[PDB]
Amino acid sequence: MQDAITAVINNYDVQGKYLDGAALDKLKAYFTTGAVRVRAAAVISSNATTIIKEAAAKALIYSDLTRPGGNMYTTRRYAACIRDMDYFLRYATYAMLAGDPSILDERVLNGLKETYNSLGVPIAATVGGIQAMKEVVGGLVGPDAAKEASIYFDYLSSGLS
Amino acid sequence: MQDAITAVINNYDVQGKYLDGAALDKLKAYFTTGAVRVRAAAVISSNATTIIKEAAAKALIYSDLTRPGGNMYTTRRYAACIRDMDYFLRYATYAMLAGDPSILDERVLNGLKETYNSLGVPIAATVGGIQAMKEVVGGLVGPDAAKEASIYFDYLSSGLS
Amino acid sequence: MQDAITAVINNYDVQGKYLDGAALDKLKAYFTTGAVRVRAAAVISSNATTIIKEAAAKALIYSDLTRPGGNMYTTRRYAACIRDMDYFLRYATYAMLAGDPSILDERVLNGLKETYNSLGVPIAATVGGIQAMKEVVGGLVGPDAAKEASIYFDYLSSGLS
Amino acid sequence: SRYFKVTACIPSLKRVRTGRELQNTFFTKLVPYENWFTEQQRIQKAGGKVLSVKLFTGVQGANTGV
Amino acid sequence: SVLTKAIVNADAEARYLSPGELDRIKSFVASGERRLRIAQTLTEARERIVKQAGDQLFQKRPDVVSPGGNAYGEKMTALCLRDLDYYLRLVTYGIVAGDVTPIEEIGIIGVKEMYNSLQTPIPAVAEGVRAMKNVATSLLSGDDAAEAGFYFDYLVGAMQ
Amino acid sequence: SVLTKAIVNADAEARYLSPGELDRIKSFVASGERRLRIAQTLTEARERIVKQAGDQLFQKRPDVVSPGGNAYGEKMTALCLRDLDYYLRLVTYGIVAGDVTPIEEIGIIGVKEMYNSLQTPIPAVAEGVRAMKNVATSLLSGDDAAEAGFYFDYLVGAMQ
Amino acid sequence: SVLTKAIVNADAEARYLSPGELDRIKSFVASGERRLRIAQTLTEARERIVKQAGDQLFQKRPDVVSPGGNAYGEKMTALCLRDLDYYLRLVTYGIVAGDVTPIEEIGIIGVKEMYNSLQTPIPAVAEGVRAMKNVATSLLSGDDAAEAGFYFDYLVGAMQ
Amino acid sequence: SVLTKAIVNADAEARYLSPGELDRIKSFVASGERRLRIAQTLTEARERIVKQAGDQLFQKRPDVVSPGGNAYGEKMTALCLRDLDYYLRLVTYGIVAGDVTPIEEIGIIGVKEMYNSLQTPIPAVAEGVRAMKNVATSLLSGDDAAEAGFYFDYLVGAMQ
Amino acid sequence: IDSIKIEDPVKPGDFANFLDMARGIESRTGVWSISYESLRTLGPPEGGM
């Protein structure tokens, strides 16, 4: 994976350039944001189970998916769906700390569409569940944090779709 | 492992003897007991969690073991102890169906003392827990079943001590 | 393994005692020395190869050990011996940071003696090599750290002997 | 090649396992010499204790045939 | 502890401690004096914290202290308080260690399995810890409270 | 970086970031402004540092700058200086990252094998880095120099 | 089914089906007609079984049908009954199959995790299944009831 | 030896020795008498070979015998000669064995690590072995020298 | 030489909070009136002895 600080370093290393003021400014920008991000991450981790429950209630459950024949029908499939939700939440939190979307591409997004298509998992519903989580997260984290949090959730959703 | 039927066969095979009426009578004895054993086994499996809880309440918990400085202190150790209790119960049930104590020697009893000594697990307390389970099991299974069940519990306890 | 801080915690946990003033004093004693240890560790790591060379020169090589009939004769055995020297140095550094010798017991001293006895590795020479490393290190780390570093080397040597 | 006979006892301190793990916990075994140093380390990191070590095969202090 | 964790990662890589890892050790030893003070405050107020948190939990959830509930009856209620006290003690250990390693070994591994045998409801236990955090936060200074909050939050997350 | 390392360890454990790991990130973001200043100082003085370090190295080891030695001849001497410059650039990157992870991929993995093919002596290279540290330390403030020292030491350790 | 299980064991052994394994298949096919009758009886009485079992469960545990409880409210109470109906359907499938494989794949794998998200208490669910068994037993003939009992017991064992 | 190697390969295959493997043993035992003569010649001329090779090596690498260099000083120079003598003895053992297995255990495994601690340059050592080969070749008959050359070459290959 | 603190309003006023120390009214149905030290030695819940 790559983070904001490393991303700057890598760009300068391919040029072979020593770090310069312009580069320093980008690094400085991350450092101000950082404290806020750490607080947001702790909030998410503590409320993680609740976030997933609320998001499922909003989108997945009480639906045709849960009703027989639906892909979230059967305990095995229900459990798998909430497991995937948890993964998305955990990785989005990692991305928010890192300040980079790259980790999502490397670890979550790679191969996901193809896997889902073979499984028969409905992508649109999954995207809906991610969007639901984002809304719930937004409330918990608070507004300043929410903007930062939202971009990573949006990045996941766009990748899946 | 060995069961009652195979135990007779093995004894005759070392002699080289064809199966005889006296041998047949021992086999016949097992076959009458068998139906009762199957019923007992189903009772134990359904009530397994309860049996362990009751037995722990009788011997292990509310004791110095659970209190700080005791072997069953800390969640990790508490969980390990009730896991061992479950093992003993499951293997005794297997032995009762089999009608032979061999499986207990082969799987449960072999190496247990040495492992326990290195771990620092107290054997006497463990034995006490097994004896407690036996009493609880006796009630559930009913008297005819209980006699058969008791011998395997006793066999475990003697092995451990 | 345990360090200074966890050593106190574990001692109180078995009693089930909340940390008290006596405990707090011990923890404070560690915290005040910490910065010094970190500096010492960096010195040792950077000079690790040199420390082993100097220690071997002072205590092992140019001797009967390196000559035919000696345990550190052959490239294979010379290499094995300086490999062991490297671990002792690395583990002593870990112990010095931790402020606890437990790691030395758990991950160095345990089963070393038995292995050495079967091999016939000469203990006195090894201890001599550990003692030699100690002398070398004391110079590099300086007054702040020398006393602290020394005790872990002494602990290793006394464990073998 | 030289071989070691090794007895060790290893506890599971990170997790609680339902399947029978007795064979993993107390394991006397024969180890090639070239593997032992790694296998000792592994037991130590797990917080197992190495109860015994004996050299089953091979001669102590042999320059060749090792 | 912080120290233990750093050493363990290095040992796995079979390397000496990284410059970054060394820096983290330095920072922790500087923080240590403040941490000790935070822990002392909580230790002094412990009896009050446990009692108040128990109050709140029972108010939030009547059920646990009801004939159906596990906590019902004096003895049971005492045991539930004893549990809260255990978790508070663990949190104090955590603050001085600077990591949850102490907490985790004693309290978070096998906790689900233990409570399931007892039949105690895990979400209620989590609520009790949340309650304890609120009491603790009030006694602590704002900066101190934030530090303490993390450790409390970890517990709540683990017991879920 | 500090961030990368923390995330990677958590991902392996498949857990959210620990309270202690979060605290380390907080400390690092506070430190960052100072770190940027330290890096800038070294960047400005780089040409001087390299030159001075080169001289010291050649004085310390006649052999490298001798007909037998690898450094001998103008082209070779330039290359040896170029290498010193590369290592200094890496050190600056490391200081801002707070960890050697970036440094390690670019400079420390495969370094032995590369130098062995070239036939350059590794211990001499290490001496050059030590030399660079001494020059750099003098320019830096005492507190700054200690921070910078660790990164320099890591390099010396890796080339050993 | 019995068939599926037998084939799977043979595949693992990489052998043709043993005489003993073939005998087990023979016994199952003989029993099949009786099994179908038992299943039909339960299917007809399903609405009654669910309703009566629900009532017994609510009597056994007032809490679930209380403001704190998960079952509280009409919609929630319906859902709890719906779940009981699902488990009854699974049991009928199990009886005809002669094994719990059908039951297990649809209902017992991941059940803990599903219920934990919902926050439904697992022991109460088990009680509801026990209740269903008692109702079912009364409708069934004694011999039939014993057969049915095993499958009911398995469910209770799997989630408790 | 050739014998050891053949048996070891057979034991791994868990078979009696193959016709081809047996043939190789036959050829080796025929060669053996000649091999013993070659070894004797080298043993007799050993003192001369070492001395001449040393001189050439110091001619080839002035640096090693210079104040910076490891070989510098009488004791150090003696040790460098002692090492050359050791390698010559190993070569003789190898010639009679017909295989480098004996040589490899005593001299080639761990050689890099040993020399790196000493700080002796490995390429210089290889040059000394090459030097020894040239002297040895002159004393040996052309056919004998070729056989001896292989063993000398192996050494050079093993440390390079 | 100041104790400082006391920054939030020292008293909301008669109407808010007060009588904070209710603790010790009847038997410890709640948590108050159970000894903090008693916990160290709870004993069996049956407590048959």
Ligand SMILES: *[C@H](C)[C@H]1/C(=C/c2[nH]c(/C=C3N=C(/C=C4\NC(=O)C(CC)=C4C)C(C)=C\3CCC(=O)O)c(CCC(=O)O)c2C)NC(=O)[C@@H]1C
């Ligand atoms: C209170 C918040 C909730 C509650 C608690 C409760 N616990 C018990 C019984 C026990 N609790 C423990 C727990 C621990 N032992 C440990 O090692 C640790 C980690 C340090 C803990 C947390 C133990 C071992 C017991 C068993 C008894 C004993 O300790 O000897 C009860 C009693 C119920 C019973 O015995 O069945 C209760 C009530 N119950 C609730 O409902 C509250 C939400």
Ligand SMILES: *[C@H](C)[C@H]1/C(=C/c2[nH]c(/C=C3N=C(/C=C4\NC(=O)C(CC)=C4C)C(C)=C\3CCC(=O)O)c(CCC(=O)O)c2C)NC(=O)[C@@H]1C
């Ligand atoms: C409970 C009555 C008592 C208790 C038990 C206890 N056991 C352990 C650890 C282990 N228990 C075993 C035992 C078995 N594993 C098997 O495979 C079998 C046979 C099927 C048995 C019976 C083993 C191997 C371990 C080690 C690893 C593991 O978890 O399996 C502990 C934990 C000790 C530790 O520190 O690791 C405990 C507490 N101890 C008591 O105090 C009770 C009286």
Ligand SMILES: *[C@H](C)[C@H]1/C(=C/c2[nH]c(/C=C3N=C(/C=C4\NC(=O)C(CC)=C4C)C(C)=C\3CCC(=O)O)c(CCC(=O)O)c2C)NC(=O)[C@@H]1C
């Ligand atoms: C050097 C100071 C002395 C010396 C060393 C020596 N050691 C071996 C062989 C082994 N060393 C170990 C030891 C360890 N196992 C561990 O877990 C640790 C802690 C990290 C250590 C240090 C082991 C396992 C072996 C055997 C396997 C291996 O070679 O890796 C030898 C070789 C002996 C032989 O006959 O092959 C030697 C020479 N002996 C001396 O002469 C010095 C005094």
Ligand SMILES: *[C@H](C)[C@H]1/C(=C/c2[nH]c(/C=C3N=C(/C=C4\NC(=O)C(CC)=C4C)C(C)=C\3CCC(=O)O)c(CCC(=O)O)c2C)NC(=O)[C@@H]1C
């Ligand atoms: C009744 C005995 C208990 C009870 C049940 C309860 N369940 C829900 C919600 C759901 N239940 C399920 C269960 C299943 N899906 C499956 O695939 C299977 C196996 C075939 C089962 C049994 C599901 C999927 C849901 C989610 C909602 C949906 O169906 O779309 C609730 C309500 C949800 C909530 O948490 O409010 C309840 C009440 N609750 C109890 O406590 C009773 C003891």
Ligand SMILES: *[C@H](C)[C@H]1/C(=C/c2[nH]c(/C=C3N=C(/C=C4\NC(=O)C(CC)=C4C)C(C)=C\3CCC(=O)O)c(CCC(=O)O)c2C)NC(=O)[C@@H]1C
């Ligand atoms: C000569 C070609 C080069 C050279 C040699 C040199 N060697 C040493 C020291 C030692 N050399 C050995 C080597 C061996 N011991 C063995 O068991 C084997 C395998 C059979 C060998 C080849 C050893 C063990 C030593 C250690 C000291 C001792 O003799 O016990 C030195 C001195 C080392 C020092 O640091 O002072 C030297 C100089 N050095 C060169 O530059 C030549 C190219």
